Amino acid sequence: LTQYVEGQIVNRNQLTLKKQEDIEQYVLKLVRGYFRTTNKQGLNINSVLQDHGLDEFDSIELAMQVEEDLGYVISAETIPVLNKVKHFVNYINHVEQFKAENGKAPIA
Amino acid sequence: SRIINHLRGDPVYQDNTKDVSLRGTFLRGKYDDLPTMIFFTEACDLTANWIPFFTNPQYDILAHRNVWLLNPRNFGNSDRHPSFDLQEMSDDVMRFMYSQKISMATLGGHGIGGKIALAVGCYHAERVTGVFSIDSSPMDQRYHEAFKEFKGYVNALTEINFKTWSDKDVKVFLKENIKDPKWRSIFTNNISKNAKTQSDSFNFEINYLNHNLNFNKADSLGNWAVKNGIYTGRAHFIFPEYSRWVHLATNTLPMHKVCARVKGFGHDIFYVQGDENPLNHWVYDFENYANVVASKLNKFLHSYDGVHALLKDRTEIGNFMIPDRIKSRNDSKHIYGDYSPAHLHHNWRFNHIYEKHDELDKKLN
Amino acid sequence: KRLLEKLNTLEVENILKRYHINYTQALIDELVDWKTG
Amino acid sequence: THFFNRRHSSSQEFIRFRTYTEVLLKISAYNDFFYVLNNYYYNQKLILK
Amino acid sequence: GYKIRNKSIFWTRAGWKNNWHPKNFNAPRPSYGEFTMGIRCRNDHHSFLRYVQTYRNMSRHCKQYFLGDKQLEETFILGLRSLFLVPYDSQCLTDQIKHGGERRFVDQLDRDFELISYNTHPYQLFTYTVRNEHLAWKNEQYEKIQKGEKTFEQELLDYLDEQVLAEKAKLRDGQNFSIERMTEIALHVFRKARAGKVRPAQDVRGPDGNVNDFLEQRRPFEHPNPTGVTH
Amino acid sequence: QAPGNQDKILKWISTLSNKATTGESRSYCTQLSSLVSFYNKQHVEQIPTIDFNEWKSVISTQGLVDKVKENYESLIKEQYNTDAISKQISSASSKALDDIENELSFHAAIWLNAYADYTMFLFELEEYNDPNDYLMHENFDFFRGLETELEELTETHNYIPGAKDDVNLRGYLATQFAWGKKVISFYRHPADDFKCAKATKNMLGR
Amino acid sequence: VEMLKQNQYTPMKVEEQVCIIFAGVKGFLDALVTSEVLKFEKKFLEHVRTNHSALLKRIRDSGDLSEVDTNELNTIIPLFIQEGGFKLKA
Amino acid sequence: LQWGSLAERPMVDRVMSTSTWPVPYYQRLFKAYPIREKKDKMSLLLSDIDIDDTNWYQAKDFLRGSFRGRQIVDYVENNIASNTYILIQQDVANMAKAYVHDICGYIDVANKENVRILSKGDLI
Amino acid sequence: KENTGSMKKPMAKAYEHPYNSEHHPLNFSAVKIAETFHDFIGPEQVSPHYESFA
């Protein structure tokens, strides 16, 4: 659960949102944290990542970061459909609903 | 004004070949202390035509060296003497270098000028750092078509008599007798009217020149004699791909035959990519030819000119050690070993930089 | 055009040609006027 | 073949794209003179005009 | 300087500059169901997702040895994208490759990842060496700054700012201090500073200002020519 | 004041307009030009002098000519305070100007970094001379990074020359006179084999 | 012809006519459509009186069109046509 | 520290040598490279590469080293509606808008002053 | 304001591979074989003489 940060070992912390308002804020904070994102303040819930300097390969780096912060195991079949902020919010909800009903994580 | 400074004088006919003084244009460099470059223009050709090449910011040649655009004897403003012996014409430069307090200089030439530059290195090698020849070779050109036209035109120019002929009679004579546009323009601008408009005449000695060419013997300017010897120093040759003066097939061998340090094609001998055009001899007119000559010229002056023979480039100065021959030094208690050869200041004789730095070295200790 | 083709068959000028710079007739006039003026 | 193509294959009518090594060298292998030149251009034009 | 003269240099039996489908005798031909009994083929429609997971792996497995260096993670990403964007930006028509360029590139990236999983890929070892040399130079500046000392980089910037003032204080006729002029001033200083490293500045003469250094020298007694004879 | 004070202002607007390509940009350039001409319009009408004594003498209403003079002179004293305006415009300019003041700066920093790249290359290139007279491993050290690329080809067994080069010019120079003139396909590996095979009602898969 | 036309009870100043008549012979009016030449006259004169007031004074006092005025006038006439909203398609 | 004369070049460019007879016959084939060290020199591969992402990424790195540069970076990456950090100017539309919106704002300044000066007293 | 700037402390070091060295490079190339080759045949044997030995 530990990772290196600027040469120092730091304990990694996982988040549990379980709320719509907390998800929209996390995704924006996530997308605004990526060094490739343009117009970080112009980014909203209905923002197309293509309109902010992000391509298919950048959505992977974002999904890879969602696994780090939340502990999910996102399959390669789901990544290439995450092209909008709205998509990350709905996918995160679908995962929380799946574990709350099926008692297990979705197929990876 | 300042960058362009050409000493002014009147040609003097001389009976003794040693009392010959050379005159030409001097182009000052950007920086304070720089080695000097002596450049010889084509025969009967103006020095001014080479000014835009050496004074172009894009090339920036003056950033490397100070340039002396010098006229050989019987050409331009320099003194006049019937002999064209390269040994005599080479001593003229050595006296000029002495009168101007130049210990050693970089030599360059265009066409026949290239021959004049190389002769100085052949007769005075200890005082020449390098040679850069443009569309020339140390070769007999008496039977080259390009030389025959020049040899033919000069003979036609002897028919005109300025005293009787009028200005219009001259212009008609040149167009019909001179077909080449460039040679025609060069000769027109070489005509000058002496003070008091007494009469017009050529800046170059038409009589002495025609005899050298018309006779067409060893002393001819087209000829390169075995008497001239070998050049021991750095030499770089640049000529057009299709050139009437230097044919790539066989006219490159004289370079190896006359210049001991010439490595070969691609290192010291280059050809400029170009089409067949009789005007390619005048590289300074066409940007494509000039841009390559300048880059190659700046490379020769920066890395190859004035560098010891056994060293590859100027980068090896101070880090490559040359082997020594046994029993070559007077000291008997000397352990023979490798050494880095001494490279001196370009004008160490007429300055006291060594005496000055010796004092500064003592202050450290 | 026909009569023109039939008829077909200054220090400032030379100095500018050395620098292979295209010069118009108007420019030549001003430079000459600049010297005389 | 690798040495010649990477030094003589580029042309002006096409775009030469940077490789991985060319990215690391430009960003993580620049010398002191390069660092000075960039800051020299920025201060004179972007700051001091 | 020198241009290729042969006009037919880029000609191939498949067309001009065709490096996607070279002409061969056994050319691809169609297949008909009604007449086809069985077939053995390895082509599939899994290359897209394999192109996605391969990126995620090569990125995540390389970050194990970056030590949380954020500036290096972002730099590595830019380099990783340049490797995956080759098929999308190349002159080669990757969509017309002989037997499927998608499968070809994916199988090629998989060979790079295998070496990456072992930390034996030349890009990794090259990134570590390049980065360590960079931090050693950055730490040298830090140690000199904590001592209040001036860095060699700041001394140049200060020496260049004052030279600009000296050169523009005399440039009154014109007032366009072009970027060209700013450059040649800096390069002239660089050439003198570059030569100063090998020959430092002892006195007011400055960097590499001693003629005696270029007189005849000899190898020291304690370090003779080890590779060859001297005489 | 009147002459020559607007010559420089005309060059700036001319260059600004010449750079405009889209019609929308041309429109804003016209708007900008009008504002400049509006602010730069010269007023010359030979403000006449008033001789109240002359009018006072010839004819006037008692107290009028004097009242106009004292009141006229009072307003003549009032004048614009150029100092106050000069300071406000210099301290803070505007909002929209700050948007492009920071945009064009980063824009220039992008292209100054590229200008420095090309410049420093030509600076380092001065030490490189006669590529044909350097040893193999010394040349690769000038072009640092080629050895790393050459290792990747070897470790992946991409030992077909020019397979990962989009323009394998070296391959074209070697095949100028080859039978079946062809170059290797892009990213071709010596181990990949896409051969297929089928069985039909006819023999030989036909 | 479209330039010489004039309404009733609308006299023009001598200096103003010189400017308009100048733009016509020089051929600048060939750019805009003919139907827009008449209105261009009004807009051009008004634009001159406001911004270019010293120019009108010289032409009036001296009564001659100096070379300096020609260059300035020759430069604004093509410029103004591009500034105002007209039918540039000839 | 010592810098010498700006005009003078390094002594290497000024220091020269000349040849004489006899001459060594040997023609050097290659440059000596006994020790494999080429430190402090940048790669010549970085020669003719077009503008790319490394240009704006390295610009921020150098801009973040200055106080004024840090403001430009934060504002550009947050308050500029652009689909890429590779800024290319091919029109002056965005530049003219910001000028007309600023130089126009300072209109009515003189007419405002006239109100005060003229509203002061009535000529009559 | 610019003169008041400071510099952050950078990282001490990046990853050091325990099985790659300059003399024993992990991966193979013809560049390292060239270094070992020219060390075997030695550098160019430059003659200081004016005539060849033969």
Ligand SMILES: CCCCCCCCCCCCCCCCCC(=O)OC[C@H](COP(=O)([O-])OCC(O)COP(=O)([O-])OC[C@@H](COC(=O)CCCCCCCCCCCCCCCCC)OC(=O)CCCCCCCCCCCCCCCCC)OC(=O)CCCCCCCCCCCCCCCCC
């Ligand atoms: C008990 C008592 C017994 C012992 C007593 C002691 C006696 C011991 C003997 C030792 C003698 C002194 C040794 C001195 C050095 C070696 C000899 C020598 O000439 O070196 C200088 C000679 C050149 O002199 P240089 O002036 O210093 O070089 C200047 C230039 O760099 C050169 O290149 P350039 O082109 O720039 O300049 C011109 C160049 C132009 O000429 C050349 O360059 C020659 C071209 C040759 C290269 C062509 C490609 C062939 C080589 C491919 C490599 C194959 C071998 C390796 C592969 C297998 C791995 C083992 O050189 C010349 O001017 C003419 C060449 C010299 C005259 C002809 C000599 C021919 C024989 C030499 C080779 C030996 C052949 C094998 C014979 C042995 C039989 C077992 O060097 C060589 O060319 C190669 C030397 C290799 C010799 C090995 C054999 C040593 C034994 C010597 C005994 C005499 C020869 C007996 C054979 C008789 C057959 C007719």
Ligand SMILES: CCCCCCCCCCCCCCCCCC(=O)OC[C@H](COP(=O)([O-])OCC[N+](C)(C)C)OC(=O)CCCCCCCCCCCCCCCCC
């Ligand atoms: C000494 C070191 C060892 C050397 C090893 C061998 C070196 C081989 C050098 C490479 C050349 C190899 C020849 C391949 C044929 C190239 C020409 C060609 O493609 O034909 C096009 C030819 C020529 O087309 P063209 O247009 O390019 O040239 C025409 C020539 N002129 C101009 C003169 C008319 O056209 C054809 O389509 C003919 C097709 C039949 C080709 C016959 C190929 C038979 C060989 C293939 C089997 C080999 C596999 C062996 C595997 C062994 C496994 C154990």
